[PDB]
Design a protein around this motif. Sequence first.
Motif, PDB file in Angstrom:
ATOM      1  N   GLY A 111      25.742  -7.914  58.375  1.00  0.00           N
ATOM      2  CA  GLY A 111      24.987  -6.685  58.220  1.00  0.00           C
ATOM      3  C   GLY A 111      24.786  -6.287  56.771  1.00  0.00           C
ATOM      4  N   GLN A 112      23.604  -6.577  56.242  1.00  0.00           N
ATOM      5  CA  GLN A 112      23.296  -6.251  54.856  1.00  0.00           C
ATOM      6  C   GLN A 112      22.975  -4.767  54.729  1.00  0.00           C
ATOM      7  N   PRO A 113      23.710  -4.008  53.920  1.00  0.00           N
ATOM      8  CA  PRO A 113      23.417  -2.583  53.756  1.00  0.00           C
ATOM      9  C   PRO A 113      22.487  -2.301  52.587  1.00  0.00           C
ATOM     10  N   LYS A 114      21.708  -1.232  52.741  1.00  0.00           N
ATOM     11  CA  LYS A 114      20.786  -0.812  51.694  1.00  0.00           C
ATOM     12  C   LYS A 114      21.557  -0.318  50.475  1.00  0.00           C
ATOM     13  N   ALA A 115      21.054  -0.650  49.287  1.00  0.00           N
ATOM     14  CA  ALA A 115      21.753  -0.308  48.057  1.00  0.00           C
ATOM     15  C   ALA A 115      20.752  -0.148  46.921  1.00  0.00           C
ATOM     16  N   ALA A 116      21.217   0.484  45.837  1.00  0.00           N
ATOM     17  CA  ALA A 116      20.530   0.870  44.608  1.00  0.00           C
ATOM     18  C   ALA A 116      20.491  -0.290  43.615  1.00  0.00           C
ATOM     19  N   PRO A 117      19.360  -0.481  42.929  1.00  0.00           N
ATOM     20  CA  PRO A 117      19.240  -1.602  41.985  1.00  0.00           C
ATOM     21  C   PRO A 117      19.862  -1.330  40.620  1.00  0.00           C
ATOM     22  N   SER A 118      21.160  -1.593  40.476  1.00  0.00           N
ATOM     23  CA  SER A 118      21.808  -1.472  39.174  1.00  0.00           C
ATOM     24  C   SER A 118      21.226  -2.487  38.194  1.00  0.00           C
ATOM     25  N   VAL A 119      20.769  -1.997  37.042  1.00  0.00           N
ATOM     26  CA  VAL A 119      20.056  -2.804  36.057  1.00  0.00           C
ATOM     27  C   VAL A 119      20.779  -2.701  34.721  1.00  0.00           C
ATOM     28  N   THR A 120      21.035  -3.853  34.098  1.00  0.00           N
ATOM     29  CA  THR A 120      21.640  -3.921  32.775  1.00  0.00           C
ATOM     30  C   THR A 120      20.763  -4.765  31.859  1.00  0.00           C
ATOM     31  N   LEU A 121      20.786  -4.435  30.568  1.00  0.00           N
ATOM     32  CA  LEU A 121      19.979  -5.121  29.569  1.00  0.00           C
ATOM     33  C   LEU A 121      20.826  -5.482  28.357  1.00  0.00           C
ATOM     34  N   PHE A 122      20.486  -6.613  27.738  1.00  0.00           N
ATOM     35  CA  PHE A 122      21.083  -7.047  26.486  1.00  0.00           C
ATOM     36  C   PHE A 122      19.999  -7.529  25.532  1.00  0.00           C
ATOM     37  N   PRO A 123      20.115  -7.213  24.246  1.00  0.00           N
ATOM     38  CA  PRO A 123      19.191  -7.770  23.256  1.00  0.00           C
ATOM     39  C   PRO A 123      19.599  -9.182  22.880  1.00  0.00           C
ATOM     40  N   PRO A 124      18.702  -9.960  22.269  1.00  0.00           N
ATOM     41  CA  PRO A 124      19.092 -11.295  21.795  1.00  0.00           C
ATOM     42  C   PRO A 124      20.180 -11.215  20.734  1.00  0.00           C
ATOM     43  N   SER A 125      21.097 -12.177  20.779  1.00  0.00           N
ATOM     44  CA  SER A 125      22.231 -12.188  19.870  1.00  0.00           C
ATOM     45  C   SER A 125      21.811 -12.665  18.482  1.00  0.00           C
ATOM     46  N   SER A 126      22.666 -12.375  17.498  1.00  0.00           N
ATOM     47  CA  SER A 126      22.403 -12.815  16.132  1.00  0.00           C
ATOM     48  C   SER A 126      22.527 -14.327  15.993  1.00  0.00           C
ATOM     49  N   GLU A 127      23.404 -14.952  16.783  1.00  0.00           N
ATOM     50  CA  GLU A 127      23.521 -16.407  16.762  1.00  0.00           C
ATOM     51  C   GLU A 127      22.250 -17.072  17.273  1.00  0.00           C
ATOM     52  N   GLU A 128      21.633 -16.498  18.310  1.00  0.00           N
ATOM     53  CA  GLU A 128      20.359 -17.017  18.798  1.00  0.00           C
ATOM     54  C   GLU A 128      19.255 -16.827  17.764  1.00  0.00           C
ATOM     55  N   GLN A 198      11.507  -2.873  33.317  1.00  0.00           N
ATOM     56  CA  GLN A 198      11.277  -1.959  34.428  1.00  0.00           C
ATOM     57  C   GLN A 198      11.446  -2.709  35.741  1.00  0.00           C
ATOM     58  N   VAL A 199      12.236  -2.139  36.646  1.00  0.00           N
ATOM     59  CA  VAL A 199      12.550  -2.754  37.929  1.00  0.00           C
ATOM     60  C   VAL A 199      12.092  -1.813  39.033  1.00  0.00           C
ATOM     61  N   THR A 200      11.245  -2.316  39.926  1.00  0.00           N
ATOM     62  CA  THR A 200      10.749  -1.557  41.066  1.00  0.00           C
ATOM     63  C   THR A 200      11.447  -2.042  42.329  1.00  0.00           C
ATOM     64  N   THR A 205      12.094   3.432  40.653  1.00  0.00           N
ATOM     65  CA  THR A 205      12.043   2.593  39.465  1.00  0.00           C
ATOM     66  C   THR A 205      13.223   2.920  38.561  1.00  0.00           C
ATOM     67  N   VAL A 206      13.980   1.892  38.187  1.00  0.00           N
ATOM     68  CA  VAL A 206      15.093   2.017  37.253  1.00  0.00           C
ATOM     69  C   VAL A 206      14.724   1.246  35.993  1.00  0.00           C
ATOM     70  N   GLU A 207      14.692   1.941  34.859  1.00  0.00           N
ATOM     71  CA  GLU A 207      14.246   1.366  33.598  1.00  0.00           C
ATOM     72  C   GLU A 207      15.330   1.518  32.543  1.00  0.00           C
ATOM     73  N   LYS A 208      15.655   0.416  31.876  1.00  0.00           N
ATOM     74  CA  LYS A 208      16.524   0.412  30.710  1.00  0.00           C
ATOM     75  C   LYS A 208      15.725  -0.057  29.502  1.00  0.00           C
ATOM     76  N   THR A 209      16.179   0.336  28.315  1.00  0.00           N
ATOM     77  CA  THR A 209      15.493  -0.022  27.083  1.00  0.00           C
ATOM     78  C   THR A 209      16.502  -0.480  26.040  1.00  0.00           C
ATOM     79  N   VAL A 210      16.056  -1.392  25.174  1.00  0.00           N
ATOM     80  CA  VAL A 210      16.841  -1.871  24.044  1.00  0.00           C
ATOM     81  C   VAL A 210      15.967  -1.822  22.798  1.00  0.00           C
TER      82      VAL A 210
END
Lengths: 213, 49, 49
Positions: A111-128, A198-200, A205-210
Motif C-alpha cells: 500500500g503506497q501512501p500519498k506523500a509530499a515531494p521533499s526537494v533538495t538542491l546542491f550547487p556544483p563543487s569547486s573541485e568540479e 521547480q518540481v510539480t 509546486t516546491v521550488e528551491k534555489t541556489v
Amino acid sequence: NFMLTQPHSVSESPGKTVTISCTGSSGSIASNYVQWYQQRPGSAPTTVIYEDNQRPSGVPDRFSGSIDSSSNSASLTISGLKTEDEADYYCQSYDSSNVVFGGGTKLTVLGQPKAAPSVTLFPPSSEELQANKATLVCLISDFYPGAVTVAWKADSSPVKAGVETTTPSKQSNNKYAASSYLSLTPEQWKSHRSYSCQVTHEGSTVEKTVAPT
Amino acid sequence: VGYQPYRVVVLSFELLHAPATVCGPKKSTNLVKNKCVNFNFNGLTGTGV
Amino acid sequence: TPINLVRDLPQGFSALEPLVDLPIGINITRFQTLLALHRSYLTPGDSSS
Ligand SMILES: *[C@@H]1O[C@H](CO)[C@@H](O)[C@H](O)[C@H]1NC(C)=O
C-alpha cells in the motif's frame, strides 16, 4: 526452423485455474520431450515439470502438464495460484542437438501512501569547477505518486539543454524518489545570478534555489 | 494484449417488405441529348430522344 | 395559405404539396394534437385553474 510459441502475458486471480500453452511450429509436440522451467526474477531457473507428466520431488501437485499432439501444443495447467508463483515459465524442447526455449509466461496479481515531494538542491563543487565541468543536481524524494515533472530555471528562463532526469524508483519508505541533473559549463553557471529547480507534484509546486557563492 | 478493454460494436442489417431507407449511392456518368437512346430514370425503361 | 377570416372557411381552392415522406412501416390507430399555453403576470403561474 522449429520454434515454440508461448503467450507473452497471462494473468489470473489467485485460487483459480489457468492453462499455459506452448505450440510447436514445424515438428509435432509429441515427438520430443517438453520441459517447463519456473524462474524467479533475478534468480536461476528451476525445473518445475518434466517428461510431460512427471513432477520433480519438492514442487507441489498443482503443476500439471498435458500434451495435445493433434493441435501441436503443449499445455501446462496450474490450479490454486498464490503469491510465489509470480515467475517466468519457459517451455523447453531440446528436440535434438538444440534446446528451443519458449518465450515465457509471467504472472500479474494485485500500500503506497500519498506523500509530499521533499526537494533538495546542491550547487556544483569547486573541485568540479577546477575540472572544467559544472552539474546542478535536483533530487525529489519521499513522494507518491511517482509522476513528477522537473523544469530547470536560470533566474527566470527555463533550461532544457543538458537536462537529465531519472524515473521514480521504489524505496523502503513505501514512497518514490527521483533525480534531475543539469550539466553546464563553468562560465554558464556563473553567468546567471541564480539557478533554481521547480518540481510539480499533484498540482503543488516546491521550488528551491541556489546561487554561486 | 489479451485482457485490455476493447470497444466492440456490431452492425446488423434487416430485410423486410419495405423499400430501401439507408443504402449507398450510385455514380454519375455523362449525359446525352437529341439522339435515340435508352434511359432508366427509376421508373421506366424508355428508349427515345 | 393567407386569409383574413375567423369562421366559415372560404370556398376557394388550394392544393396541398408534400414536405417530407417518412418510410417508417409501423401501426397507427390513434392521434392527438398538442397545444401551448402562456404564463404571463396576470395568471398565478400554476397549471390548475
Ligand atoms: C398492427 O395492428 C393490427 C390491428 O390494429 C394487428 O392485427 C397487427 O398484429 C399489428 N401488427 C404489429 C406488427 O404491431
